[PDB]
Amino acid sequence: GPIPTAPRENSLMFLSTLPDDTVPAYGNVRTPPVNYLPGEITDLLQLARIPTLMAFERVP
Amino acid sequence: GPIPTAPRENSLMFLSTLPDDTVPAYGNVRTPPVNYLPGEITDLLQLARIPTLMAFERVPDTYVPYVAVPTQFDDRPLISFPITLSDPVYQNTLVGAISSNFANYRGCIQITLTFCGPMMARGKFLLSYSPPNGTQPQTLSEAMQCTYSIWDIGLNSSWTFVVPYISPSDYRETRAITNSVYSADGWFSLHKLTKITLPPDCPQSPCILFFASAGEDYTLRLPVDCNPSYVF
Amino acid sequence: NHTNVKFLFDRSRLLNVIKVLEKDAVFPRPFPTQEGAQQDDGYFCLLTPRPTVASRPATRFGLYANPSGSGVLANTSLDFNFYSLACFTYFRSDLEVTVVSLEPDLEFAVGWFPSGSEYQASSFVYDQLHVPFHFTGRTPRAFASKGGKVSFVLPWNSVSSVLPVRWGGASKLSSATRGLPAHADWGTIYAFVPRPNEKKSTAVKHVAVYIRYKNARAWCPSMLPFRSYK
Amino acid sequence: NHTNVKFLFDRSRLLNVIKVLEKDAVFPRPFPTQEGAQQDDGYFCLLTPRPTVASRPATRFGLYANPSGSGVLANTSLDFNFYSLACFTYFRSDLEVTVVSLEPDLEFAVGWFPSGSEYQASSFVYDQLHVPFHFTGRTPRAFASKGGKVSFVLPWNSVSSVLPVRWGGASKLSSATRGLPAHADWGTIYAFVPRPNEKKSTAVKHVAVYIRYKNARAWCPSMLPFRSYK
Amino acid sequence: NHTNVKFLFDRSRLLNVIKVLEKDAVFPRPFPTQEGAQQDDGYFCLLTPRPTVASRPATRFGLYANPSGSGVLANTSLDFNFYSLACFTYFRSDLEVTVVSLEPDLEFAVGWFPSGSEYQASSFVYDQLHVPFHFTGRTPRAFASKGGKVSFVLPWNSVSSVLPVRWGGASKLSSATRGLPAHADWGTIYAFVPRPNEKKSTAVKHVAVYIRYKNARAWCPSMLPFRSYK
Amino acid sequence: WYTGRLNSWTKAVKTFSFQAVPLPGAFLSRQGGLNGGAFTATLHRHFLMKCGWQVQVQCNLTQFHQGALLVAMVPETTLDVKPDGKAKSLQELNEEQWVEMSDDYRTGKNMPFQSLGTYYRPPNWTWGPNFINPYQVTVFPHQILNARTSTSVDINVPYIGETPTQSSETQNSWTLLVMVLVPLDYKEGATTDPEITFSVRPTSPYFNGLRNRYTAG
């Protein structure tokens, strides 16, 4: 049947953190495999765990 | 296939009470559990059931939540009022306050009384209800024809009273812009049945208090927006 | 199947035309009313097929066939189509409301409350700007873009079991007029512009109203209006 | 079922009206504040039912019933409806925000950040055009066409387990005012125009704010405000 | 889960502001460049988080803190947020582009090409009307109504396996500057108006750019920028 | 079990007048001549606490006495401070002897607040969220005190709070108050102006942290 047009409350808007995707532009692409690179990172906790050195202003 | 665009009749509108949800903004959140807090609330009926104390303007700006039995005697009731939630007497009770935020109510009204006086004094009291008529009844004789009950001073100290729900409809107007059958439901009164006993050297002028609460079948309907006058 | 009451009473018809609010304003006061009051007229309308005068229930219908005179004129209305349609002592149904502008390229919102309540008056002041409180409340407020179109369905909202087409009782013991019902309505409707009162404009705006009955039922057939032999 | 707290606290109500940003601007500074500062007011608003003054938490509510005087006026707000509605020592729910323009045919965007953060100041210069940094950041920025309408739902964002309706403790060991909470809010909201500061205009713009509670819960009943016998 | 790189690098941020094309125009030429050339600037922008100058790759970042002087100024940019966010020697992800106008009620279209290509120059003449060839081509061209909004996702388009955050090699045997990468970009973007050059107008138009990373990955952690103790 | 002495009832006391004991804050000042001796100091060497309470009251009237007193546990109250923002002194307690009703308390008007400063205009304060509703006090856990049958007070309130635990020196979520329902009256000769005594017991406490004795800021 015809479009049972149900207008949306606040469409025609731009939102920064909209999770959904958008229309592809230049699909059907192939990429060079990158499995040869070691040292993959998952979360910042990996770097947060490694210790480092603090400092203090030189005593007068 | 392509969007079979079916335009909607009145889209691009903003509506106050639209039930559906909207787009999430900052999802993937975690919250601290709150199970440790007791005293959860489900519906306003929980607060509406708990009784409270009414009040009356001081007999000739200080309202009083108590009444003292006088030594003088007259056939007229000592204290009476219409059963209408808009009256000042309910204007601070929890039930009255909650009802003020609704279009209509439904159910019975529960009333409680308490005595506070001497040791070796006794007496009798009569409780009555009168549906609406030409004018409020005045004489205990006229009141006696209506529904009434006997409350003895000495048997107990709080002879609970409940006004039955009577009306020619399914509900009644919470507020009365103009007097109407569905709005007012007559009055309620108390009568001194016999002279009380004054024992040796005891103080005089005992004290009596009254409490109101919503009946088990009490129910409201049709929420509304509040009057913001109390800010002033 | 055309004869079915449901298949008949399911179409929209015009009801009345009203102006657009620009301030808190005072609500009309009951009759008889003396002069000098600040109550304004032509802004609030009650949802009822039965005759009404000055946004209040009425018994006798009138019309201003004589334009000249002195005093304040009044609004009136009656659902010609509904009354001529058929005969039914009793009736009940959900009332559907719709509004469309009558001015060039206008935007606004609409406000409603059910029976038994009354207009909320007074206004606040924000950063030296005065706004009536009727903007916000417990009841729905609707918003539409320019051009404008408003639609929604209201549920039954009156204490009485049904709506009496031709009633003959009385409502109160003293001074009550015989035959005048009490709450045969779905409430009151009003329109306003989301602008501060400080920016009021002289030009008046006007808007029409359309209603539609959904899921109608009837009882106790009756008579139909007479037509002359002139 | 009308008595259910959830069925009651699920409707939109107006909160406050604010102007539209046109530059980086300085954020208000805590109290007491001395004169000569460049902090500007009436651009930032905090999301909180409890009373607030000059976009900051407060304890006592005030109103400018006396217009005349000297100095800088301040903003205030309090959810009349929520406070009058019921009694609950504790409360928690997701806060839904919505905004609509109050000027003819305007377009803009809105910006928000949660509690604990603060406004980002300073501005860049592109090809001799100055733009505040608040345009871009880690947090959402919303865009709407002319006319305007903004809607979304924010999740709970405060460290405290619930929101205290009437609290009586203190927040810090020294100088802390008794009873003044710390983070009973959902953050701060602000509006701005996607134009360079170089093209600022004198005419002011104003915008209203509406909020709605979703999935409300309560604990520990309480009392209700008093009303006079005058 | 907030610490996840994917959950972090999935939000839009501003990149740069550019003017609107009105003619074929000459593309910028490599450095050093002598005076008298017709190459125009501020119309083409390259998609790259790393620092760039005059729409070309660069190594050292600069800023025009001193306004006065003589000569031609240049554009610059760097993703402050991305660089401050975290440490990763290598990175790859699809780049999402979005554009919004910065002028009142404007309509236009956008044009793009990937890396390795270059702007197509020259123009045709139809019935005494001159139109640049860049209107039509092998690559996408997007069209939007007045007001304007453009969105789409570009796939990875560079020969290199990943994007190096801090590279230290060289690209060519002779004269190549150490550490300057070759094709760490997603191409170039540009905007234009679908009108003949014969109807050019003096008033300039400006437009902003927003980008977003999708499906990000990283390798070989690194250090973070220093902050002063001043 | 800590015990304390309050001021003595007199017929001069009006109605709706009151006095309150904010626990555990009153301990710091040893309100009503009360010295726990162990918990009082143990709080100082710790910072975070989580415990319940259990209270009691007493007032001896006689055959020829009449009156009515209201006692209840009202949480999150802030009535134990002067309008400026300072707690009252022992001299002030001995002077007032009772808290009399006022429109300020009815409206929450004069509760402590921060002065705006020289930058702002002076706002007109009208209302606050810590108002007092004299009539609806009965909603919270409470009991009556009638001269004919007033024996004693008893209550046991579970723990409450915006968080599972709070700082001792600042936390205040429970408070005991007494209200004069009916003004006291009696025939001369029997007990005149009976005294009021209060007892307090915490339950299931959990003291947290460790440090030297707390030092004033």
Author numbering:
A (entry chain B): 1 to 60
B (entry chain B): 1 to 60, 67 to 238
C (entry chain A), D (entry chain A), E (entry chain A): 29 to 258
F (entry chain C): 63 to 279
According to the publication:
We used cryo-EM to image SVV particles after incubation at pH 5 and 37°C with purified TEM8 to explore the structural behavior of SVV. Although the ER-particle from both conditions remains icosahedral, there is a distinct rearrangement of pentamers. Each pentamer has rotated approximately 20° clockwise compared to its position in the F- and A-particles. As a result, the ER-particle is 8% larger than the A-particle and 14% larger than the F-particle, representing a ~44% increase in volume compared to the native state. Similarly, in the ER-particle[C], these include VP1 (S1-S28), VP3 (P61-S66), and VP4. Density corresponding to TEM8 was not visible on the SVV A- and ER-particles under acidic conditions, suggesting that at low pH, the virus potentially loses the affinity for the receptor or binds transiently. A similar SVV ER-particle was identified at pH 6 in the presence of TEM8 (48), which lacked 43 residues at the N-terminus of VP2, whereas our ER-particle at pH 5 lacked 62, indicating the incremental impact of acidification on particle stability. The ER-particle has novel VP2-VP3 and VP3-VP3 contacts at the twofold axis. Overall, the SVV ER-particle is defined by rotated pentamers, an expanded capsid, reduced inter-pentamer contacts, lacks the genome, the VP1 N-terminus, VP2 N-terminus, and the whole of VP4. Our results support this scenario and suggest that our SVV ER-particle may represent a reassociation phenomenon of dissociated pentamers from genome release, as shown for enteroviruses.
Seneca Valley virus (SVV) is an oncolytic picornavirus that selectively targets cancer cells by recognizing Tumor endothelial marker 8 (TEM8) as the host receptor. SVV has a typical picornavirus capsid with four capsid proteins; VP1, VP2, and VP3 are characterized by a single jelly roll fold, where eight beta-strands form a barrel-like structure that is distributed at the exterior of the virus, while VP4 is located on the interior of the capsid. The structural architecture consists of four capsid proteins forming a protomer, 5 protomers forming a pentamer, and 12 pentamers assembling into a pseudo T=3 capsid, approximately ~32 nm in diameter. We used cryo-electron microscopy to investigate SVV under acidic conditions and in complex with TEM8 at physiological pH, identifying multiple uncoating intermediates.
